[PDB]
């Protein structure tokens, strides 16, 4: 299964922002990370730990070992708001974190 | 398709049309709740049917496909208050982790 710590992630455009997961048990590094922006579905952004998906840009990076992996974002921008969440693929089922949500700080 | 409200021990069959690819290795119903929380509903290997579901839904879902006409199914059965939610499907490209969008949804509510 997955957890997913922080829930909430207040961050200013330019920050850098780390969201993480860990698993019951070990598994290799079948992991995944969605972004589901609002008022849409979910989208892939990184597989395979840290394979970054088809279009996505560079400042999504993933990394983990054993249980623990993190979402890792450079410089936050303003279409990065939404909810995150992890998924791991390591047999079945594929169960997902329960998700943090990123919010920009702003004046 | 095939969402809508249902009262508590109805049933109802989900569709999900899929074009851009003529088949997908693994398509899976996965949902989300009205408090964002997602779910994984199950997952179906068309062409020998093989399937598998978590407890959640074990023995009252029914995922099914269909290789020729390009439709993934599911037929839920003795809906619970609980199954609310909104229904995707996604496919699992081959070494692919988890399961990649391409629904728009369908909202199911029981009540």
């Known amino acids: 299964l997955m957890t997913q710590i922080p829930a909430s992630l207040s961050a200013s455009v330019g920050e850098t922002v780390t969201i993480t997961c860990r698993a019951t048990?070990?598994?290799?590094?079948?992991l995944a990370w969605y972004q589901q922006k609002q008022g849409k579905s979910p989208q892939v952004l990184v597989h395979?730990?840290?394979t970054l998906t088809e279009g996505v840009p560079s400042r999504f990076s993933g990394s983990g070992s054993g249980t623990q992996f993190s979402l890792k974002i450079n410089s936050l921008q303003p279409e990065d708001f939404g909810s995150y969440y992890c998924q791991h693929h390591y047999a079945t089922p594929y169960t997902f974190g329960g998700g943090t949500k990123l919010e920009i700080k702003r004046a | 398709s095939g969402t809508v409200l249902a009262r508590p021990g109805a049933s109802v069959k989900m569709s999900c049309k899929a074009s851009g690819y003529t088949f997908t290795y693994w398509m899976h119903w996965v949902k989300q709740r009205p408090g964002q929380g997602l779910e994984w509903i199950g997952a179906?290997?068309?062409?020998?049917?093989?399937?598998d579901y978590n407890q959640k839904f074990k023995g009252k879902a029914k995922l099914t496909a269909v290789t020729s006409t390009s439709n993934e199914t599911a037929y839920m059965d003795l809906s619970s208050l609980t199954d609310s939610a909104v229904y995707y499907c996604?496919?699992?490209?081959?070494?692919?982790?988890?399961?990649?969008?391409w629904g728009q949804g369908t909202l199911v509510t029981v009540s």
């Open positions: 179906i290997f068309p062409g020998n049917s093989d399937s």
């Open positions: 395979n730990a840290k």
């Open positions: 996604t496919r699992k490209d081959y070494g692919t982790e988890v399961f990649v969008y």
């Open positions: 048990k070990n598994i290799y590094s079948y």
